Amino acid sequence: ARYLGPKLKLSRREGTDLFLKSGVRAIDTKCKIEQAPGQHGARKPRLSDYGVQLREKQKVRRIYGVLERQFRNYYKEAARLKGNTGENLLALLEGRLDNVVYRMGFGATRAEARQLVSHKAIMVNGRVVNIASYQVSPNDVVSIREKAKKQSRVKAALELAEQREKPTWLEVDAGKMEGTFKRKPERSDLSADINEHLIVELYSK
Amino acid sequence: NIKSAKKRAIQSEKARKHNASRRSMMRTFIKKVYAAIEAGDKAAAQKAFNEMQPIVDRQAAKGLIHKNKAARHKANLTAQINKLA
Amino acid sequence: KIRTLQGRVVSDKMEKSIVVAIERFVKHPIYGKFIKRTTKLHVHDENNECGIGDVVEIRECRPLSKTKSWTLVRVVEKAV
Amino acid sequence: MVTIRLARHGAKKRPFYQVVVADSRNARNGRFIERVGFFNPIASEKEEGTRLDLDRIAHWVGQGATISDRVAALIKEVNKAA
RNA sequence: AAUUGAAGAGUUUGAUCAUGGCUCAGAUUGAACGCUGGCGGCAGGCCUAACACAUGCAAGUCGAACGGUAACAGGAAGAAGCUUGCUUCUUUGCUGACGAGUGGCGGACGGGUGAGUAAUGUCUGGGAAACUGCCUGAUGGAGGGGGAUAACUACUGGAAACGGUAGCUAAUACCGCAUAACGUCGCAAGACCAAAGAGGGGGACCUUCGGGCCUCUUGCCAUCGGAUGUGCCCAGAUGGGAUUAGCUAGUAGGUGGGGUAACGGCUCACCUAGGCGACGAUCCCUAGCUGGUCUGAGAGGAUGACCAGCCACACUGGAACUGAGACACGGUCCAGACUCCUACGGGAGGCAGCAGUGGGGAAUAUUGCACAAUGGGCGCAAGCCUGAUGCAGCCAUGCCGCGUGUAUGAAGAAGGCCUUCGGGUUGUAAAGUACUUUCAGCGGGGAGGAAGGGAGUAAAGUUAAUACCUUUGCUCAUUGACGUUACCCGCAGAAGAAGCACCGGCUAACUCCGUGCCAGCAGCCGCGGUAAUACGGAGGGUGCAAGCGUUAAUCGGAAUUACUGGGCGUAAAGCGCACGCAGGCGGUUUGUUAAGUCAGAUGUGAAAUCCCCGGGCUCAACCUGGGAACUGCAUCUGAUACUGGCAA
């Protein structure tokens, strides 16, 4: 029900940093990125069309830490909502509670944020939410409880929040350790390199 | 079978007997009427019709003939006597 | 008013009764073609005025025999 | 007899009762003539918990309908407004 | 706001293009099987043998209808050990109550199953010739008598089941008599038709001093309405077969008699000789139908498990009786097959209610708890009953959610596998280090489903009455099966928690070793006869994940039945050619109609489900509010271009 394995291996099959070990240090430096996703990893794949579509879906799931039935349900919900299904799908992945806890700098990675969410260290709107996939509405206040406030992790995580780009659709404020999800993220406000038409076309075959 | 169905069995037998007797007397009076119409007798059949009328209305009221049937009888028989008289 | 139908006499020979074919003109559910379609009805008439090949209007009433729940109102167009 | 009565429709350990007008010898969640309101015994402490069409209820009691003890309790709860 | 909706590929050939079949990639399931398996929420769970059933429950209730006392607990009276003050025993239905019985109501609901039924069914829309317990409104009546019969007692038959005979008693049981309509018959005149009391309380009066009498509540009867439910009719629609073309004598219609609640060949007598049928009758095979479900871009195709509406069935075949309602699942009668008891004379039974067995099968669950809620029956109510229902148990059967940690960590450790022996890879993976405690485990706290019901008051209404009863407030104890509940807090420690398939192409993911046309694999193409990316193992990777594969089944892809949306010179496909009936289509102008067509309105298209916008469960699944939708049918109002009818 979640991955639990070598993370930088997943980041190495995709060829791109999936932010799976954000943590203390800088850019990887001990990954052997691009070089060998397994034993025959030095081989160029010469990847197919199914391979590029598949590999795009796997990039997105392995970023946000979602498995397939849950992702597939996000595609069905993004499909039925009015508008653009790629952009709706990223809006559904960005409203996840573990993601919003990661974006605010409360967790160093999304797995650490998922353990903060999971171990009842996070309230939304003054109610404790235990669930990684809670869908944070706009104009909500998500914060850390009094237990697990001033624990080392979150402090260190806010320390590495300043190294990243400070997302526009949040009120990050780390003094009180509370945040406000203000609006839904625009497609132009996130990541610029994921090709969601490939995963629309992957599920539409 | 072991219940209050035994009581409904015995009551329905008792009421079967009662209703069979009253139903049989009613039918014999109506046979008096259109068995007097079998011969060309006007006032004999009118006497029999006056003899059957209270019992057919009465068995309609008691609940075993369901009064429309009551009406039919007297209606049909009235027709017979003014087919005759 | 009353709901009535129009049709033509298809046969005649029965003892104070008649039988009338009705032409409903209904679209096919799959193919979208308007197709003629009949409905033969045993229709009552007192004193059997309408003969074969007529056109007659017809209303629904109580049952008068087996099938027969229909009775005429107006004989039109008898022309031989 | 026609009865204005409740009919259990929510999930397990979470009932939502819909008050209907049924011929009384039908099943509980079976055939009804018309539904006329609802009653959620939880709902949350928000706004309603219960709405209930008093005009149609007065129509059916005018016709001869009977009312169960809960529906009588709900009409005694929502009296005219509160 | 409520349709944002459509993918291909492999294989005919030396190669090609086309045709064309086969096959694969998706979604789904009441699933089964194999390997594996942590938790929870919500659902689902005999698809086969409508096979046979042990055992326990599944329908009772009312003494405020009645005679009554079998118990239980009191009361009165008597007698006794007598502690002259408490026990023991006895007569009394005197009382709260109540076994058995009569009687009223319910056992036609609820619950099960899908055998039969291809149209006496179902769906949609009309209709007329109807009945309707309980419930409600209105108008009125509710007077006066009689004979019985259970129970009971006494005999008595029978192994039992079950009876018989003779007496006794009651009623809201039964029967007359009176009374009689805006009721039935009748054109009228007229004729005729019913009933039942019980309970609470009481000032005065009368008491045969039991109670009359007054009042209230409730019940009875008659008629007309209403609501609900049911019966009947019509039209359209709802499988396959023409290698099934004729079927039908109560058959088709009429008249009259009978019958039903009601029309009707429903039935009978007579008369006519019809009726149905290629727009598919009749026969045969199959089948419960629908809202819906699955698939689909859609049109369609398949299906109709759960949930809900309708029908049918209740061991098998038939029949009626009682009743408002049945031709009756836990009723009666007969017959039959099976099983059982027997004293051999005869008797008894019916899980397709809920659990459960045996069998059958690839396959499907506990002989649980409670009536606390919702509903039902009975009752004035209290309450009693409820295997409906609420819940719990078992099962990864499905859907949904969460977990198996998190960060750091290069000596790129050891070991495995490969190696062009340089190294590469497993791999930040592990170990180390630093944190976190979800869920499981342990200990505390603790909502909500609980509204009612009971006991006292106070006021109002009624009344002769400050009683009784009804209604409304107030107060007082209370009412939870689930349930060591949901949820909250604290404890200890990463501590209890990852498999399954695949890796030649389709199709994401590669090498080594073993085997050598073998062993074996395979959905199709096809691999294997010595260096096999296809077999078996290992390392590595890929996909899914408490699941994963295989199998079965459906739709898709399949434009390979083509209505949307195909073809026919040579690929399959133009009758050998004509004439022509039914059928289909029909030049051109004007007028009328308005059937098709179009527009609007109204009634209906059950609720749930799908869709949209919201709301509640920490979220989700789930539940839910409002709308849209249900593409239809009927009626009314219009328009008249096109099609049809009619006239020229």
Q: Do strands A178-181 and A140-144 pair parallel, antiparallel, or not at all (unpaired)? A: antiparallel
d(CA A11, CA A37): 9
Angle, nearest 10°, between helix axes A85-94 and A68-80?
A: 130
d(CA A152, CA A159): 11
User: Domain boundaries in chain A?
Assistant: 7-93+190-204, 94-180
Q: Which nucleotides of E are covered by protein (CB under 7 A)?
A: 4-7, 25, 38, 41-43, 59-61, 101-107, 109-111, 126-136, 174-177, 183-186, 191-195, 221-223, 226-229, 232-237, 251-255, 257-266, 271-277, 279, 299-300, 307-310, 321-325, 328, 330-332, 349-350, 373-377, 388-392, 399-410, 412, 417, 424-429, 434-439, 448-453, 472-473, 482, 488-490, 498, 506-511, 539-546, 548, 563, 583-585, 595-597, 606-607, 611-613, 615-620, 622-625, 634-636
d(CA B14, CA B31): 26
D52: DSSP letter = E
Residues in chain B: 85
d(CA D53, CA D44): 21
What tokens were used for C58?
């017809």
Angle, nearest 10°, between helix axes B5-36 and B68-84?
A: 10
d(CA B52, CA A192): 104
Q: Is A2 helix (H, G, I), strand (E, B) or coil?
A: coil
Q: Are A174 and A158 in contact (CB under 8 A)?
A: yes
Say how many Å lie between the first and final Cα of chain C, rounded.
31
Provide CB contacts within 8 A for D71, sequence distance 6+. Answer: D4, D5, D6, D19, D57
Q: Is C63 helix (H, G, I), strand (E, B) or coil?
A: coil
Q: Do strands D37-39 and D50-52 pair parallel, antiparallel, or not at all (unpaired)? A: antiparallel
Method of determination used here:
cryo-EM
Say how many Å lie between the first and final Cα of chain B, rounded.
58
d(CA A189, CA A167): 8
A137: DSSP letter = P
Angle, nearest 10°, between helix axes A196-203 and A68-80?
A: 100
Say how many Å lie between the first and final Cα of chain D, rounded.
29
Q: Are D71 and D36 in contact (CB under 8 A)?
A: no
Residue C73: its H or E element: strand C70-76
d(CA C18, CA D44): 71
d(CA B47, CA B54): 12
DSSP line for A17-74: --SS--SSSSS-SSS-TTT-SSTTTTS-----HHHHHHHHHHHHHHHHT--HHHHHHH
What tokens were used for A194?
């994921």
Dump strand ranges (E) for chain A.
122-124, 127-128, 140-144, 178-181
Closest to B33 in 3D by CA, of B23, B24, B42, B20? B42
Question: Reported resolution in A?
Answer: 4.5
Q: Are A111 and A132 in contact (CB under 8 A)?
A: no
Provide CB contacts within 8 A for C16, sequence distance 6+. Answer: C44, C45, C46, C47, C48
CA angle A71, A74, A79 (to 5 degrees): 130
Tokens 């119409």, residue located: B37
Which residues face D3 on adjacent strands?
D22, D66
Query: The CATH number of A7-93+190-204 is which of 3.40.50.150, 3.20.19.10, 3.40.50.300, 1.10.1050.10?
Result: 1.10.1050.10
d(CA D61, CA A17): 72
What CATH superfamily classification does A94-180 receive? Answer: RNA-binding S4 domain (3.10.290.10)
d(CA D57, CA A178): 51
